[PDB]
Ligand binder design. Structure first.
Ligand SMILES: O=C(O)C1=C[C@H](O)[C@H](O)[C@H](O[C@H]2[C@H](O)[C@H](O)[C@H](O)O[C@H]2C(=O)O)O1
Ligand SMILES: [Ca+2]
Ligand code: NA
Length: 129
């Protein structure tokens, strides 16, 4: 089981809850961006075999959040590998697994949540599981 370093994080938008808060190891710090279609992009630094993305959701034990995962070598031309809704049943890292493929960049696109239009993520980790 491999956990890859995330060398950089960017995002479409944020409200002062920075993108890099998703890789600080702290469930009390988050990235937040308001509105369906906002996204956050994780850079592995080079192309790696990836088959699993874990995300911990803000208020993750009290609301469900819609999202998709896309990956690839070109941020402008990523491929969607996963689409779903967070469980609403834990604040912990939740695993979203998919057929193994190569990627330098992993993007999470959020569609808001069952309470409001925000996309708020406390932690992300990216694996070859
Ligand atoms: O994910 C959130 O719910 C969230 C993220 C933002 O960082 C901010 O805290 C946001 O707050 C909104 C939200 O609707 C919340 O329910 C409450 O109404 O405050 C407003 C706000 O803009 O402060 O919540
Ligand atoms: Ca955090
Ligand atoms: Na925002």
């Amino acid at each position: 089981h491999m956990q890859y370093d995330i060398v950089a994080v960017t995002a479409s938008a944020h409200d002062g809850n920075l993108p890099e808060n998703t890789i600080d190891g702290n469930l009390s710090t988050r990235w937040s961006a308001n509105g369906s279609g906002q996204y956050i992009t994780f850079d592995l630094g080079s192309a790696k075999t990836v088959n699993q993305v874990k995300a911990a959701w803000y208020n993750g034990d009290s609301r469900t959040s819609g999202f998709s995962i896309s990956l690839g070598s070109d941020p402008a031309s990523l491929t969607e590998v996963y689409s779903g809704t967070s469980s609403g049943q834990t604040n912990a890292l939740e695993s979203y697994s998919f057929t193994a493929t190569t990627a330098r960049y992993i993007r999470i696109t959020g569609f808001g949540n069952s309470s409001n239009t925000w996309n708020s993520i406390t932690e992300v980790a990216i694996f070859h599981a």
